Design an enzyme around this catalytic site. Sequence first.
Site, mmCIF file in Angstrom:
data_model
loop_
_atom_site.group_PDB
_atom_site.id
_atom_site.type_symbol
_atom_site.label_atom_id
_atom_site.label_comp_id
_atom_site.label_asym_id
_atom_site.label_seq_id
_atom_site.Cartn_x
_atom_site.Cartn_y
_atom_site.Cartn_z
ATOM 1 N N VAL A 32 6.754 7.607 -2.695
ATOM 2 C CA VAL A 32 7.128 8.646 -3.683
ATOM 3 C C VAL A 32 7.248 10.000 -3.021
ATOM 4 O O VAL A 32 8.121 10.789 -3.360
ATOM 5 C CB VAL A 32 6.152 8.815 -4.863
ATOM 6 C CG1 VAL A 32 6.336 7.733 -5.891
ATOM 7 C CG2 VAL A 32 4.723 8.917 -4.423
ATOM 8 N N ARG A 78 0.821 -1.206 0.000
ATOM 9 C CA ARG A 78 0.000 0.000 0.000
ATOM 10 C C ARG A 78 0.861 1.265 0.000
ATOM 11 O O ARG A 78 0.386 2.357 -0.329
ATOM 12 C CB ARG A 78 -0.947 -0.039 1.217
ATOM 13 C CG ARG A 78 -0.356 -0.732 2.436
ATOM 14 C CD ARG A 78 -1.052 -0.381 3.733
ATOM 15 N NE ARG A 78 -2.222 -1.175 3.980
ATOM 16 C CZ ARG A 78 -3.141 -0.912 4.819
ATOM 17 N NH1 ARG A 78 -3.062 0.150 5.496
ATOM 18 N NH2 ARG A 78 -4.164 -1.715 4.979
ATOM 19 N N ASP A 79 2.138 1.085 0.320
ATOM 20 C CA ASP A 79 3.065 2.187 0.569
ATOM 21 C C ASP A 79 3.494 3.073 -0.613
ATOM 22 O O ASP A 79 4.128 4.105 -0.387
ATOM 23 C CB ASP A 79 4.345 1.639 1.212
ATOM 24 C CG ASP A 79 4.224 1.450 2.709
ATOM 25 O OD1 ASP A 79 3.327 2.049 3.342
ATOM 26 O OD2 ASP A 79 5.056 0.697 3.260
ATOM 27 N N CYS A 80 3.170 2.710 -1.849
ATOM 28 C CA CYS A 80 3.744 3.433 -3.002
ATOM 29 C C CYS A 80 3.577 4.930 -2.956
ATOM 30 O O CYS A 80 4.440 5.664 -3.412
ATOM 31 C CB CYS A 80 3.155 2.955 -4.325
ATOM 32 S SG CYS A 80 4.101 3.574 -5.740
ATOM 33 N N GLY A 81 2.447 5.383 -2.442
ATOM 34 C CA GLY A 81 2.205 6.817 -2.324
ATOM 35 C C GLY A 81 3.078 7.457 -1.263
ATOM 36 O O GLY A 81 3.729 8.464 -1.518
#
Lengths: 136, 122
Positions: A16, A10-13
């Site tokens: 970045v 879930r961490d992609c946001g």
Amino acid sequence: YKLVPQIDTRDCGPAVLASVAKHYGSNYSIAYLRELSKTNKQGTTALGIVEAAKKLGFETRSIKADMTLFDYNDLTYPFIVHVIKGKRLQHYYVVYGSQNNQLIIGDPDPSVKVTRMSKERFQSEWTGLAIFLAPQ
Amino acid sequence: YKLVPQIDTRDCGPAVLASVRELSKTNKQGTTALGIVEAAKKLGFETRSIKADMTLFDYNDLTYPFIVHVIKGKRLQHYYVVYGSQNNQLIIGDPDPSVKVTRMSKERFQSEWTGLAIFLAP
Ligand SMILES: CCCNC(=O)OC[C@H]1C[C@@H]2CCN1C[C@@H]2c1cc(-c2ccc(OC)cc2)nn1C
């Protein structure tokens, strides 16, 4: 190019985001940004990325562009894009620059990290949404 | 063209799901495309989502109605219903109660669309 890989799906946001802060100085824990960006089970929304960015003291803007965006040299890197990779609909990259036909991107996917990318490829994944940040 | 206008700036996702109330992991920011899908799967839907370009509307198979993710100004998680591609113009539904159903030029639609289409059937 100082990039922060993700780990939880879930961490992609958050990732970045943090990748961006490092570059322009600051360090910030991803679990924090999870909660700031209102990342939930299914990643962050474009909106979430923004609110957050603002709260870390960022001047934020977002636009719908097309590829021509990259024909313009004053383009202040780094900045963020919303892209689709396969079944990941809420994915995002950091865009660092472009020597050649090619973009320097950071895929928080720890298996990809920073990498060059063709524009055909990039066009095909990119939603047109770009989010530009600078400190206040 | 059956369309359900929204109320709060967040309901746009639930609203497009209205496709022939209040639900489905829709938080303070509209939704994710992901959420739209899961939900659609509940309600008993077969869900296909794909990144396309405008060529998609060259397809005679195109099963209307279906959903798109678009950007309207600073509404980044907005969505429309697409009813038909009757010529150089689209029939869309904007849950924005000030717009609802409307024709739209393809230049305009291209300019708002994220490429993401979500197709549903029972
Ligand atoms: C569940 C209802 C929809 N199911 C579905 O499989 O897709 C809808 C149609 C549209 C078209 C013809 C049959 N089927 C899939 C087809 C389509 C167009 C495209 C397409 C893909 C990429 C494009 O630009 C990059 C453009 C079109 N892909 N696909 C699979």
